[PDB]
Design a protein around this ligand. Structure first.
Ligand code: A1AN1
Ligand code: PR8
Lengths: 554, 1036
């Protein structure tokens, strides 16, 4: 291209470069190529000198000049979408009424919402993201996902006025309980919408089937809906951020990656995990094989704002931890006191999206990306807390790709390709820590309905699973911050444990979390750990031997 | 005091940081791998703001705060300290006088070149400001290279001047974010190492013979004195090389590298030559690598290989393709690449560096971009270097060259001539892009005329009289003298002349003449000499036949020569199974022939002697000597040698190889007394020296193998003949054993070494040893009268002195050709391109002019041994073997294994017992491991071809290396080897690098030993004694 016809001239110093004069014949050179490549980089084009040198004519190297950024399809993608590991896990769990396994939230606005305006927004917002249109063919003895070209039946919409009933909260609760049931996964709108009018304003309901949504994806969706509604209220033509790699392309590269040599390199780690976890078992107050979500009860423990601000802003520095390392260490101590096992396995929900496929960009993708990986905690050497905290930090740092790999090996790798991994370990206990609630309050133009009911995003959602669904996890522990307080929620199956035993485990948790917050604030030195030093495979004995050798050499 | 808070990060070393860490740990006893800039600044400079800007510069770059820790760690680490100020010194010299200032300056600068850096304990940069005058400053700035490529100083000094301007003008730094070197460390760890090592093992696939340049001596000690030579090509030659490059579609760098390759080929007598190339191992894939400060420069093996018929253009394109293919893999450490070669440690031994953009001039112009109060007025660079030669090339308006060489190893004349050869190659290529590689000359007219004068300095005038005329004219000088003696009977010159006249009369009556070859099958009895001289006097050529040779050969010679007549004794007649007349030389009719002189009825140039050589054909080929070839010899031998009239000489050799009759003619044509050796005395050496004593024999003709072996046998030692005065030998590379050395002194016997192929003449060079000194492998000497020796390359181009090439012979000792099978003659004889009109003949031998003008032998071109990558003088091994009082007779041969791999075996005859390991140690006491044979064989007697040359056919095949048993006294001492090398449980005797260790693993080994054993074993000790046995001196 004429751009490169110029960029040669302004580097090599020879004029009138032709369409197929030779880089060397013009006097190019092993170095001047680096200059040409840097100059072309100012036009946002990438070219390897490995091609400039090898095809030394402009007409021939044009075949390799590339954009520095892709511009993924802003239009429409459709057709078969391979099940991701979390989706395959879901269909393998075989819930009673798989059409009732949802996420939702209820928005509010001080002056309400015009129904035609919000409907006009939900039209485009459900056009833009393609996965939200998908449907799940209950045929051929299996499941296969499909994505739908635009038409009718994108979303299901309901409208109500509750002002006739003083208990608006009960009326909206009982009515919203309906929609959660109504996911015609075979072919239907996997987004449910409702609007509830009231003297205090208009209440705006959104609900989405979990197979097509995620926490991060709910942030994305709320910021997209906030801009969409701002555009509609301003009366401008509605248009949205540039589409990132849309979920079909994600599933596709994921199944391509699901067999690559990179992921398979992890296999000996996950083997060491499963081979070490085999004999773990949390003891039960009552022995029963399955329970239903209606049996689940939840209870909460809280930290005061002072302890919360200490936990966030200061404890990290004593060991260069992140928040998850301290919460998990406290959980380890709690199970060491309460279960008296030598070990426990705790499952965590990573957000996925872990820069796995190098070319991929999913920063704007809407889908269920959650990656579930087990972690084994050592509970033996709890007495030197200064070193239990470090052991927990480095255990969390030994996970090879932040856990995205394990689900892919469990569900999506070619079954002959995946070695000895049994995948027999089951989530008796699972732990997650959400961020701030500002993933919901991410914009001021509307706010969460005070009548939120059981319809929250997280584990404190009440309507979002069918009461007849199985219990898939025995202890479900999720952290959040509200109003500057950390809350840990322990949700448990009654008829597997009794209330007093979860009160005990939760008080042991609060006690040890406070102990760790204090210990990490009173300690004045930053005792860095081997992961801090960018040397692969460094260990405590080697790190402290190196540091001793520095003292003997400075 | 230290605290953990002061460490910022750690990293593993990059490949080239590992290389320079190796250097700094090796050379410690006199280490310095230290760039020094001198930058002179004139104007107004605030030394305060220059100190502060240096400190900000050291804060800015983590590599200026890196310390390297290797002592007890599993692995060398970079440790980046958070803060580490460098030594900055300010000297106000402005009070001193100029002769004092410049002295104090230079004394500082020289001592600073000597002041080593401790890679751990001491900041790896130094700056000194000198204020020479009110507006004149010098900066000395020295740093270990391990920090950065020297050219990075352009970035570092642009940064420094930007900081200085920001300070003096109180303005924020605009400096772009530093590209972190951890990006390169991470990228190096992400790369697929094994694919690169596979590429490098493919690139070196066939690399047989190590490249060399003519070293002055073996590196008996690491004395070093950095010396330079520099020269440049004219403007026109530089621009024409640039045009060649622009038209063959290559860079001028590739032209320079191909010209260097062609030079190395000519110097090495090889078509495949490998040398080190220094490459900017900055991958274009890395974001921002073009401004990244760190150590990236890598040494990669650069390989130029010619096909036998390839043109220089076609080698240009080949080298271009190879360099393009190498670029993906040039970040591999050279210490790993070495393991992908059979040469291991010795793969690269000199560097060619092309400086397309130097640090000087660039630094000496950038500073004009700023309004600051000073201008860079002068600039200099210093850099130590390990290699014995480096070649720097600087493609300016004139292509400038510089050789940095250890003057302890290369003579100034060697480098001077190498520069002249580079000029000559460059000019040849520049004028004609398409010349054949074998057709480029190395030599200027000053070399050429000298080498051709080495011919004419042998010039002589000789009467060219026929060989039997020279005899006749001598025989009249002493007719009463006894010419030839047998067991009891003898002939005077008169009796010889008469009997030869009689036989010649018989032959001429029998139709003998100029066209005629006469067979002789005579039993080396008296009549044999009469047979020769009568046949020649009959004007025909004698064809000597061996009574002991196979009947198959006696038939082949007779049927291939078209001999009309054979002469034999009666009892040998039955050998002559051919349908040809067979005359008894005793025939009475010849006894009755007229005894007076017959006439010289032949021309000065006719044939007179056919002998058949062995060779590569199963058919022996009949080679024939013209009268001029032998006549030229005889006069030279009289004029300039130490044959004498009154001497007594055995005709010992088997009457059928070129020397044997040359003893006859030299003896006859000087009036001496010949004694005809009884063919049983040809084997019972116990009787030979006795007969020598009893007859007072004084000139002997002995094969080279005879000197290698027979005087070494301890039983024979005391029977050496005391009457001997000259022993003349030819045949093979001569080994004068130490016993033979001693048995020359005691009687001051003159030993003569004569080079000669048969087709030229019995000899064409001589060296004569009086006993002042006698090297074990003597030269072949000086060309005889009216001969040239031309050491050519395959294009008949003269090749420089001291360099191996084809040994061509010229002058009157060149025969007519091959008698039949004549079409082979045009392959072996031609016209002298440098003296047209004189005939030329090719020996298949390589030789070298010595600086003293003697000629030095390098064996056959067909049998270049080159085992384990290294060429190996079988003469050196045969010397060490034969010197052992246990060894009578050693022959060393390159065998081919049953896979086709060549390997060395020594066939050895033992006087007294020893065993394989004992002689292997005996060799290792004196000879490198590449030149110790892998197998040894014991025999009763080395077989010899009837001429005395050893028979490579008659030796038995080998049957069934470094291997040694398990022997560990303390596996606590070995488990470090076990864990580092990973190969196996280890034997104490095993050799570190042979077992696959390499330099960096030696660093790992030392740091382990100095932790687990608390001894600081120097990195040199693992090279002096690279085995676990070496520890004893540190624990006993
Ligand atoms: P064990 O058994 O493990 O064995 C491993 C060994 C061999 C022992 C290992 O430890 C080892 O010793 N390492 C290798 C051998 N040691 C060395 O000493 C290697 C070495 C030699 C010399 C230097 C320095 C040089 C040479 C660099 C000069 O050239 C130059 O301009 N810089 C680098 C080249 N690139 C440039 O900067 C610009 C020149 N053109 C180029 O771009 C490239 O050179 C091309 C691409 C090849 C040509 O371009 P285009 O035409 O194709 C400059 C400085 C001179 C010296 C100095 C002063 N310092 N270092 C470093 C290491
Ligand atoms: N002194 C010597 N040093 C080294 N090489 C020698 C020497 N003399 C000869 N050559 C070798 O002789 C070879 C050619 O002569 P050819 O072998 O046909 O004949 C013979 O050898 C006859 C047989 C009896 C004695 N001459 C040369 O290539 C060279 O290697």
């Amino acid at each position: 291209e004429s751009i490169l016809v110029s960029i040669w001239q302004n580097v090599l110093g020879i004029e009138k470069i032709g369409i197929r004069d030779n880089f060397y014949s013009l006097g190019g050179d092993s170095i001047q190529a680096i200059q040409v490549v840097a100059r072309l980089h100012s036009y946002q084009l990438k070219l390897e000198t490995k091609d400039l040198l090898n095809y030394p004519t402009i007409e021939q190297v044009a075949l390799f000049v590339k954009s520095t950024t892709r511009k993924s399809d802003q239009g429409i993608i459709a057709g078969n979408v391979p099940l991701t590991p979390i989706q395959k896990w879901f269909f393998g769990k075989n819930f009673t009424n798989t059409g009732h396994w949802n996420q939702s939230s209820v928005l509010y606005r001080p002056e309400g919402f015009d129904p035609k305006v919000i409907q006009s927004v939900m039209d485009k917002i459900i056009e833009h993201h393609d996965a939200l249109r998908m449907v799940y063919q209950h045929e051929n003895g299996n499941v296969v996902q499909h994505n739908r070209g635009l038409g009718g039946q994108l979303y299901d919409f309901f409208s109500y006025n509750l002002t006739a009933q003083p208990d608006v909260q009960q009326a909206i609760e009982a009515e919203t309980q309906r929609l959660h049931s109504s996911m015609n996964l075979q072919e239907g709108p996997l987004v449910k919408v409702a609007l509830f009018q009231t003297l205090h304003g208009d209440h705006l309901f959104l609900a989405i089937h979990h197979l097509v949504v995620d926490g991060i994806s709910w942030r994305i969706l709320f910021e997209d809906l906030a801009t969409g509604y701002a555009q509609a209220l301003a009366g401008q033509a509605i248009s949205l951020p540039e589409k990132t790699d849309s979920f079909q392309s994600w599933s596709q590269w994921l199944q391509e990656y699901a067999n690559e040599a990179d992921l398979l390199s992890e296999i000996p780690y996950w083997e060491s995990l499963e081979s070490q976890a085999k004999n773990v078992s949390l003891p039960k107050d009552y022995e029963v094989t399955d329970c239903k979500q209606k049996s689940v009860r939840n209870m909460r423990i809280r930290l005061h704002p002072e302890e919360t601000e200490q936990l966030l802003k200061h404890a990290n520095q004593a060991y260069q931890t992140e928040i998850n390392d301290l919460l998990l260490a406290a959980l380890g101590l709690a199970f060491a006191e309460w279960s008296k096992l030598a070990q426990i396995v705790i499952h965590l929900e990573g957000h996925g999206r872990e820069d796995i496929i190098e070319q991929a960009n999913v920063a704007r993708t809407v889908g269920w990306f959650t990656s579930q990986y087990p972690v084994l905690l050592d509970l033996k050497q709890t007495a030197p807390l200064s070193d239990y905290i470090k052991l927990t930090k480095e255990n969390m740092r030994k996970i090879p790709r932040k856990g995205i790999g394990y689900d892919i090996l469990k569900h999506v790798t070619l079954p002959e390709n995946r070695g000895s991994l049994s995948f027999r370990v089951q989530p008796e206990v699972t732990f997650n820590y959400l961020g701030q609630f500002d993933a919901d309050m991410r914009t001021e133009l509307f706010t969460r309905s005070p009548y939120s009911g059981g319809n929250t995003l997280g584990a404190d959602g009440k309507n979002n699973l069918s009461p007849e669904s199985e219990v898939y996890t025995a202890l479900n522990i999720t952290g959040l911050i509200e109003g500057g307080e950390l809350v840990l929620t322990f949700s448990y199956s009654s008829e597997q444990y009794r209330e007093e035993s979860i009160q005990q485990l939760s008080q042991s948790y609060q006690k040890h979390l406070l102990a760790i917050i204090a210990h990490c604030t009173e300690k004045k030195e930053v005792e860095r750990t081997p992961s801090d030093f960018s040397v692969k495979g460094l260990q405590m004995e080697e790190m402290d031997d190196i540091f001793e050798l520095l003292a003997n050499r400075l | 005091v230290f605290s953990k808070e002061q460490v910022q990060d750690m990293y593993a070393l990059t490949p080239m940081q590992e290389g320079m860490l190796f250097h700094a740990l090796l050379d410690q006893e006199h280490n310095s791998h230290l760039v020094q800039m001198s930058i002179s600044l004139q104007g107004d400079l605030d030394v305060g703001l220059f100190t502060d800007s240096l400190h900000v510069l050291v804060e800015r770059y983590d590599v200026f705060r890196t310390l390297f820790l290797y002592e007890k760690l599993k692995q060398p680490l970079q440790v980046v300290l958070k803060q580490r100020p460098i030594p900055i010194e300010f000297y106000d010299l402005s009070a001193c006088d100029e002769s004092e200032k410049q002295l104090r300056y230079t004394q500082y600068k020289r001592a600073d070149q000597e002041r080593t850096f401790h890679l751990a304990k001491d900041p790896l940069m130094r700056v000194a400001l000198f204020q020479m005058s009110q507006h004149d400053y010098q900066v000395i700035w020295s740093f270990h290279h391990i920090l950065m490529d020297g050219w990075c100083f352009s970035i570092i000094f642009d940064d420094l001047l930007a900081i200085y301007l920001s300070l003096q003008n109180k303005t924020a730094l605009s400096l772009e974010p530093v590209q972190p070197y951890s990006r390169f460390i991470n990228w190096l760890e992400k790369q697929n190492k094994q694919a690169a090592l596979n590429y490098w093992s493919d690139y070196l696939e066939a690399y047989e013979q190590k490249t060399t340049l003519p070293k002055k001596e073996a590196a008996f000690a690491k004395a070093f004195q950095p010396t330079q030579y520099r020269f440049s090509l004219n403007r026109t030659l530089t621009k024409q090389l640039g045009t060649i490059a622009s038209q063959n579609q290559v860079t001028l760098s590739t032209v320079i590298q191909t010209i260097w390759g062609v030079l190395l080929q000519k110097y090495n007598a090889a078509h495949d030559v490998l040398f080190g190339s220094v490459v900017s191992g900055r991958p274009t894939d890395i974001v921002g690598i073009d401004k990244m400060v760190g150590l990236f420069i890598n040494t990669i093996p650069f390989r130029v290989q010619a096909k036998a018929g390839q043109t220089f253009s076609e080698l240009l394109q080949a080298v271009h393709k190879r360099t393009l293919q190498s670029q993906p893999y040039e970040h591999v450490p050279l210490y790993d690449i070495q393991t992908q070669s059979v040469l291991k440690q010795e793969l690269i031994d000199h560097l060619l560096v092309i400086e397309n953009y130097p640090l000087v001039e660039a630094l000496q112009k950038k500073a004009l971009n700023q309004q600051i109060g000073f201008t860079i007025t002068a600039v200099e660079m210093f850099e130590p270097t390990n290699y014995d030669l480096t070649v720097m090339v600087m493609p300016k308006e004139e292509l400038a060259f510089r050789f940095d060489y250890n003057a302890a190893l290369f003579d100034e004349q060697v480098v001077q001539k190498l520069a002249g050869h580079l000029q000559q190659i460059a000019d040849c290529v520049a004028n004609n892009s398409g010349v054949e590689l074998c057709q480029i000359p190395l030599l200027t007219e000053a070399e050429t005329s000298q080498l051709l004068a080495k011919r004419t300095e042998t010039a002589a005038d000789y009467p060219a009289a026929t060989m039997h005329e020279l005899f006749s004219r001598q025989a009249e000088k002493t007719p009463e003298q006894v010419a030839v003696v047998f067991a009891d009977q003898h002939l005077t010159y008169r009796e010889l002349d008469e009997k030869s006249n009689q036989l010649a009369r018989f032959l001429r009556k029998k139709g003998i003449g100029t066209g005629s070859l006469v067979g002789t099958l005579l039993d080396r009895s008296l009549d044999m000499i009469v047979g020769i001289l009568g046949v020649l006097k009959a004007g025909g050529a004698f064809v000597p036949i061996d009574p002991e040779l196979p009947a198959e050969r006696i038939a082949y010679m007779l049927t291939h020569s078209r001999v009309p007549l054979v002469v034999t004794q009666n009892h040998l007649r039955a050998k002559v199974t051919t349908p040809t007349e067979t005359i008894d030389i005793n025939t009475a009719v010849i006894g009755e022939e007229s005894r007076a002189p017959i006439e010289s009825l032949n021309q000065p140039h006719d044939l007179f002697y056919i002998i058949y050589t062995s060779g590569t054909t199963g058919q022996p080929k009949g080679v024939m000597l013209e009268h001029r070839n032998m006549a030229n010899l005889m006069h030279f031998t009289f004029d300039q040698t130490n044959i004498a009239f009154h001497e007594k000489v055995l005709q010992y050799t088997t009457c059928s190889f070129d020397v044997c009759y040359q003893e006859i003619f030299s003896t006859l044509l000087s009036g001496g007394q010949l004694y005809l050796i009884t063919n049983e005395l040809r084997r019972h050496v116990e009787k030979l020296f006795a007969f020598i004593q009893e007859k007072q024999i004084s000139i002997l003709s002995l094969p080279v193998s005879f000197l290698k072996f027979i005087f070494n046998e301890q039983d024979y030692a005391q029977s050496f003949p005391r009457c001997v005065k000259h022993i003349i030998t030819a045949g093979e590379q001569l080994v004068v054993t130490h016993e033979l050395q001693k048995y020359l002194r005691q009687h001051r016997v003159f030993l003569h070494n004569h080079y000669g192929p048969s087709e030229t003449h019995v000899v064409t060079t001589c060296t004569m040893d009086p006993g002042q000194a006698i090297p074990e492998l003597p030269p072949i000497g000086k060309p005889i009268s009216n001969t040239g020796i031309y050491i050519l390359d395959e294009g008949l181009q003269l090749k420089p002195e001291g360099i191996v090439g084809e040994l061509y012979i010229s002058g009157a000792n060149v025969g007519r050709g091959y008698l039949h099978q004549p079409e082979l003659t045009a392959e072996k004889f031609l016209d002298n391109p440098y003296q047209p009109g004189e005939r030329m003949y090719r020996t298949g031998d390589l030789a070298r002019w010595l600086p003293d003008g003697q000629l030095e032998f390098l064996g056959r071109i067909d049998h270049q041994v080159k085992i384990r990558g290294h060429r190996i003088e079988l003469g050196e091994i045969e010397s060490r073997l034969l010197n052992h009082p246990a060894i009578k007779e050693a022959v060393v041969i390159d065998r081919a294994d049953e896979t086709g791999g060549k390997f060395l075996c020594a066939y050895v005859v033992l006087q007294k017992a020893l065993s394989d390991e004992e002689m292997r140690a005996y060799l290792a006491q004196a000879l490198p491991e590449y030149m110790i044979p892998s197998f040894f064989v014991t025999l009763e007697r080395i077989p010899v071809t009837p001429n005395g040359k050893t028979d490579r056919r008659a030796l038995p095949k080998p049957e069934g290396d470094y291997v040694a048993p398990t022997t560990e006294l303390e596996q606590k001492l070995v488990a470090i080897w076990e864990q580092i090398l990973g190969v196996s449980p280890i034997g104490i005797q095993d050799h570190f690098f042979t077992l696959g260790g390499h330099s960096l693993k030696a660093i790992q080994l030392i740091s382990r030993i100095q932790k687990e054993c608390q001894a600081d074993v120097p990195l040199r000790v693992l090279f002096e004694q690279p085995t676990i046995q070496a520890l004893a001196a540190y624990v006993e």
